Design a protein around this ligand. Structure first.
Ligand SMILES: [Ca+2]
Length: 78
DNA sequence: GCTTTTTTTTTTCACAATCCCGGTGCCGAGGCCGCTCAATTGGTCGTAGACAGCTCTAGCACCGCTTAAACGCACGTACGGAATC
């Protein structure tokens, strides 16, 4: 029953939930949609990718396709 | 989830065009022939260039500063392209 309060992971729950029920939000896609006056100028997104894989493992996130040329990971309903 | 609607299918039917065949007939690809001139045979005679030996050109290697240009990095404007009509 430990409430964890992440930083960049909080940043991706708004970047995942900004689009709804159709599987269209990728690491490459999210990084260009989220890069607005806060984050590390360069290689901030490597931690974006670490945040997303750990978010998948909590159970909040799922995937249909991912990495390379195309992807999509979105919030599996609680 | 449930009707109650659009949206996108699939299906079914009639029709146009193309496709494949054998039948037919015409002519040019193919080969033969008989001749001829260009390739071959064997010859002389000259030098183009292969090769050895030497010169010394200029390409390579290396080095030590002095910036100028490349890098990367942040930021956001005007650009590309999706949408509409
Ligand atoms: Ca000869």
């Amino acid at each position: 029953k430990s409430t964890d309060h992440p930083k960049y992971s909080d940043m991706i729950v708004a970047a995942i939930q900004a689009e709804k029920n159709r599987a269209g939000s990728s690491r490459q896609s999210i990084q260009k949609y989220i890069k607005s006056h806060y984050k590390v100028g360069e290689n901030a997104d490597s931690q974006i990718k670490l945040s997303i894989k750990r978010l998948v493992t909590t159970g909040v996130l799922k995937q249909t396709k991912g990495v390379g040329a195309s992807g999509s990971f979105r919030l599996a309903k609680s």
